[PDB]
């Protein structure tokens, strides 16, 4: 259903009005999983910070860097 | 009104040649002389870093020992498109004489 990811870096606020934060997320899976230590760039709505956790659901789309 | 540039915005000295055959702008297709158009040779990666990593993992051919192919393109823009795309920007009058002879 949804895969948990850990925010390891806040790349910066993106978009007009600065309400969207672009972050680097490491997928949290056990050792040997295909998503183990897989890092993707995501766009986050709401106040977030480093070491926060996200429920990604889909983990294929990667946010365009800004 | 006033002569803005000594070279008149092109690489055609007064006694070098009469006409330079124009080219189509890379973006809009506007015809501009080849010596005037803003020329850029771009070597772009076919994939960004993340996608290239995934494709290289699935590729028996591409990996640490064999690099992925790149795109090679000579792009010539009309002046308007070069400015609008920010390939080139208006500069202070004293900085307009600064020229680069190699890609930095």
């Amino acid at each position: 259903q949804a895969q948990v990811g850990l925010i390891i870096k806040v790349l910066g606020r993106t978009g007009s009005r600065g309400n969207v934060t672009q972050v680097r997320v490491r997928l949290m899976a056990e050792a040997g999983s295909p998503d183990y230590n897989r890092t993707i760039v995501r766009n986050v709505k709401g106040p977030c910070k480093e070491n926060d956790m996200l429920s990604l659901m889909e983990t294929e789309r990667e946010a365009r860097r800004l | 009104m006033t002569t803005k540039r000594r070279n008149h915005g092109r690489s055609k000295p007064a006694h070098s040649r009469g006409r330079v055959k124009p080219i189509h702008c890379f973006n809009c297709g506007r015809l501009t002389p080849k010596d005037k158009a803003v020329g850029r040779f771009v070597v772009r990666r076919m994939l960004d870093a993340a996608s290239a990593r995934d494709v290289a993992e699935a590729s028996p051919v591409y990996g640490a020992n064999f690099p992925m192919p790149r795109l090679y393109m000579k792009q010539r823009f009309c002046i308007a498109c070069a400015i609008h795309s920010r390939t080139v920007r208006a500069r202070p009058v004293g900085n307009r004489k600064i020229r680069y002879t190699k890609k930095v």
Partner: protein
């Protein structure tokens, strides 16, 4: 777009179940003989599958065709024309060779002369090919000039020597030996070695070879080219 088609017809079975698999066989001068597989409709009525298989052109990378060759082979593709169907084996003949687009485009540099030569030659067995050689000028080791453009008379001299060598070397050999020379770069090394004294060259290479005229089909000559033909198990029971 989904759900947008208005006019579908203008008036008002599984596809893969009808397909049989075939192996494509390169000539014996290539280490990997059974490169590539393909499909074709089963022979139905008067439409015999062999009649629609002959003439098909298959493209493969030279490094895949010749294992343990090197990264230089990996930037060339070789095409083959199916000349005869033997069971489920598609025996082929050389069609064309080309350098990949990325490799060829990367060879271009600004402050140098790009010299191109087109050569047409007939082999001993009546095959006619076009050769499309390209060479680049280079600065010398101690050169301080801002460009290494070549004098035009040297460019024409380079073109004539390339044309004479290629015609001399390829006109008295068969197509099989000619392909071996081209794919193993024997002609290429000969060309650059003898053309450098005319003009300092960064690199000379044959970017495209194309067969423009083939002789009348000969079954025996095709079999002599293919030597020992690896068996095809496509028609066998699983």
């Amino acid at each position: 777009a989904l759900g947008k088609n208005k006019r579908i017809s203008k008036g008002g079975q599984e596809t893969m179940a009808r397909k049989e698999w075939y192996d494509v066989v390169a000539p014996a001068n290539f280490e990997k003989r059974q490169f590539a597989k393909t499909i074709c409709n089963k022979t139905q009525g008067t439409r015999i599958a062999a009649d629609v298989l002959r003439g098909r052109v298959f493209e493969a990378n030279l490094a895949d065709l010749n294992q343990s060759a090197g990264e230089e082979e990996a930037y060339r593709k070789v095409r083959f024309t199916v000349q005869e169907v033997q069971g489920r084996n598609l025996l082929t003949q050389f069609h064309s060779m080309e350098v990949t687009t990325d490799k060829m485009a990367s060879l271009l540099r600004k402050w140098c002369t790009t010299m191109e030569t087109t050569v047409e030659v007939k082999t001993a067995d009546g095959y006619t090919m076009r050769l499309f050689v390209v060479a680049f000028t280079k600065p010398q080791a101690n050169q301080q000039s801002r460009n290494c453009y070549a004098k035009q008379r040297l460019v024409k001299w380079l073109r004539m020597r390339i044309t004479k060598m290629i015609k001399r070397r390829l006109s008295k050999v068969q197509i099989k030996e000619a392909v071996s020379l081209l794919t193993r770069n024997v002609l290429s090394d000969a060309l650059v070695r003898r053309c450098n004294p005319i003009l300092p060259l960064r690199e000379l290479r044959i970017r495209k070879v194309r067969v423009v005229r083939t002789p009348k089909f000969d079954a025996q000559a095709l079999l002599s080219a293919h030597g020992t033909i690896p068996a095809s198990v496509e028609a066998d029971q699983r």
